[PDB]
Structures are given as structure tokens and as C-alpha cells.
Amino acid sequence: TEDQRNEEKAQREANKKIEKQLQKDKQVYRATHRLLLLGAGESGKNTIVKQMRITSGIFETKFQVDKVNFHMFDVGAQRDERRKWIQCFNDVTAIIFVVASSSYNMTNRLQAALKLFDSIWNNKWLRDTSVILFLNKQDLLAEKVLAGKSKIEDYFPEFARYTTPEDATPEPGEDPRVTRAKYFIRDEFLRISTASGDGRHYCYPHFTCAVDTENIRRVFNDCRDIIQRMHLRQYELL
């Protein structure tokens, strides 16, 4: 029955041909860092995606920094029932969270974003996943606060009891009110993230604009820091 031997040879050569391709794909898979992009539709998430590029449920994007490949997947076009498909991204290096910091006085979109951040951070399957929090639309926030018509003092009553941290590093010429509002918004999310106190994952807030070209560098630095902190915690260095 030489037919058995011929079929065995064919099966093994096919197996080796497939195995070499799998090995080749393995190097690119490990060399790449996967990212999950989240945020409300009205946020500047789409503009950030467009900048990094320059009706499916997943819009994947390809971008490289310092010869490091990053695969970001916008989960847009998905329904608000997030508790199921979110489990798929438990192994992503970081979750990029985009929030319109200027949308505090719109519905209460900022409060909804805070609740979403709480739910994602406290998610059972995302315990070891860090979050890159992009506080987007900073220019709009500055425009709205500088005008003086903003009533943020009672939309978030804790603001009146809040003052700029001593560690703040405002940009040159930045108005004191703009800095105070920015850091209040940032601390609102930091309160949610800091509550864990476990160190398995960390939040990396940033003050970014929708067309900010450095957002790619922010993502690269955040991924590098996340990996460094994971390694340090592995060796009891954190």
C-alpha cells in the first residue's frame, strides 16, 4: 500500500510548508504591540485615527515608531453592550481612552466617560491592562474656559473645592483657569484609576489635541513605560 506512504509524504510536506509560514508570522506577531482604542463617537477619536493613518466593527490601523510596529483597533460601530466583546482585548499592551475634556457642559458626556472609564478599569478581564487616557480637545476646552461663560463650577461641584496641584507643569503662557480645569479633569480620572492600588496596571493621562501629531509619540512612550513597569514589577522593583 504505497498510497499510504505517498499520502503521508504529502501531509508532512504540507505540514512543514504551513509551519514555516506560521514561524515567519510569529516574528511579526511578537514584534508588534496591539492596542485597543475606546471613546465616545463625538470625541476626537476619529481625528486621532486619521492623524495616525497619515462599516466593519473593527477599524485596524498600521503605524510604526522607531521600527516598532503597533496595531490599533478602533472598536467603533459596536453596540454599547460592551461587557462581552471587551474580553477579546485582555492581552492588549494598552487601551487608548479618548475623552473630550471640553464636553463637561454638553448631555453630561464627561460623566458618562468617567463611568465608562470606571467600568473598564474595574473590568474583571482587564485587571492587567494599562490605559492610555487621552484628554482630547484641549484647544476647545481652553476656548470655552477662557470665554468665561463656562459654568463648570457647578456641573462638577467638587471643582470649587479643588485647586491646581503643586506638581502641575503648565505650558508657557497657559491661563491659570485653563490649567486648573485641565488638572481637575485629569484628577477626576486619576481618582478612579488610583483606587485600585494594586499596581497590576497603570493609567497614563495626557493633554492632547485632536490634530496633535505627537500623539503617536505619546503612545510609543506609554507602551515603553508599561513594558518597563511590568518588567520592574516582575523583578520586585515596583
Partner: protein
Amino acid sequence: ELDQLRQEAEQLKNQIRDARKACADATLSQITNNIDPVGRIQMRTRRTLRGHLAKIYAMHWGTDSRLLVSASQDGKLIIWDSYTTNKVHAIPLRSSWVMTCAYAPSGNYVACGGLDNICSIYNLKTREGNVRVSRELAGHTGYLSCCRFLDDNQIVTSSGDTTCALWDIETGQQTTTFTGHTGDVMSLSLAPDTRLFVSGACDASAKLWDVREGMCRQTFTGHESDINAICFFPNGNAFATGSDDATCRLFDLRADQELMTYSHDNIICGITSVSFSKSGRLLLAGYDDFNCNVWDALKADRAGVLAGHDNRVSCLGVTDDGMAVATGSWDSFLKIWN
């Protein structure tokens, strides 16, 4: 107008529950007491399939009981020869986030889908011998959770938009749409005759649907948590479900209610997959705690346990001939148990 209809809904629930209670005089446990127990089922790893780069989330058995298809989140849809362990094919998916895969009963086609909201049909044995996307069944507004072939031209799919659909593959359009589910639909199961299929959903209810007539015959609400898995009893008169409730429930279409439950004090995690042996006596289910518990379908006692996986067991499937049961896990390996 609206108020009367809502009260009628509660009255309808009341009569349905009263009838279901009246149909219950004894439980399956009570009648099964005198039957000889199955005993301790012994099974250990038989074949280890390697090659998937990322966590495996779905698999299916071919009707020949030799060819096996599995899908991984890395974007690789691999077809394995279970007897020889050789990888027949390694299909590169357009979208890496595949959540379901299916193998046609004749073996000519393979289906897969996930967060891409598209079910991709692959022709395995075209005259050129190259695997290619025959057609894309777009139209769903949610991630595809499960899919199963009715034939080479028909396939039923479940999606995150709370609706299941029957697709005519050649035309690429929904022959029929199922919208009775209120929550996310997670799993599908075809009846042996293919005349009926039952879909579990995150609304904790299981619904029995008619393929040709496009309506749900019955609704089962025994579970109180998201249903992740569902499978018919081999005769087609009953089905079992898996859910995050950390318990399995068996339902009979004719009884129109839960028959019996499978649970233990040492299990607290959710259930990912469920399957039945050829005779239906053994109920095999995958659990989030990295092992699969084998349950006596009649007694609901732990007849055996499969623990050859280092991560979440995402999928489970028994061969049509009953020779072996394959299990996938997030550890990127398939373990075949006999």
C-alpha cells in the same frame, strides 16, 4: 392601548408558568435514582495541536471525524488532521479578531467571523487548490458570536445585534432574520434534522427557532446570567446551555422548561462551551477555571475532569462518530481527549 398590552404580557407569563409547573410532577433526578451510575470517566490528553500564535476562541469538528478547524485571535484559521496532527491549511483571516468558525457538513466550505461583523466563507478544495474568500456575508450590525452550516449554500449566524440570520451563501443575502432575542446572542446549535435551531443570549434566555418559518417556537428562562454555550441533546428533543451562572441547565422542547441542572459547590466560574457525547449520556462543558468537567447527563455528577489547559477553555467539541472530544483554550493549544 399600551397599558393593556403590558398587563396582558404579565398574564401570559402567568399562564405559561402555571402550565409549565403543571407539567412538572417529578424531576429528572428522581426518576434517574434507580439507574446505574456511569462512574468515573477516565480521559487524558491524546493529541496536542500546536501552531496558533494567540489564544484560541472557537473550533468545530468535521463530519468525517478526522478533519478539525480552529480559529485564533491572531488571525489564523487552521485546519488540522486530528489523526496525524498535520495542519492541512492555515487560512490568513482579513480581521484578526475572529470569534467563531464553522466547518461545512460536506467539508467543502469553512465559515468564520467575529468583531469584523462579517461572516467569511472559504472554499477549501477549489479546483486550483487555493483557499480563498468565496463570499462575505455582510449586513450584521454586531460581532458574530456563532455560525453553523445548514448546507453548502445555507448558513445560520448569531451576532451582537441581538438578531440571528439565515444566509443564502450564493446570493449573499439574509434569507430569514431572527429578532426575538433582547440581549446579545452568544451561541448557536443546529438540530440533528436541521429543521430547528436554538440560540442562547446574554438575556439569560434560550429560544428555539424554526429555520424555514423564521420564528421562535419557545423561550426558556431558567438561567439568570449570560448564556455562553448551547447544544442539542443528540436525539434533538432536548438541549443544554452554558452560562456565567456557573451551572448547566437541560431543557426539553416538548416539556418547554428546564429538566435538570448541573452544578457543584467547588465551581464558581462561568461556562464557555458545552457538548454531548454520541449517546447523550455525558455532558462535556468548558469552564473559565482552565478545566472541563464531564457531567452525567442523567445524574449530573462529576464523572470526569479534563485539566490539560493552562488558560481559559474557550471551546469544546465532540466528533460526529463519538471517537474523541477536542478542547480549545486561550493557551493556544488544542487537547484531544479519548
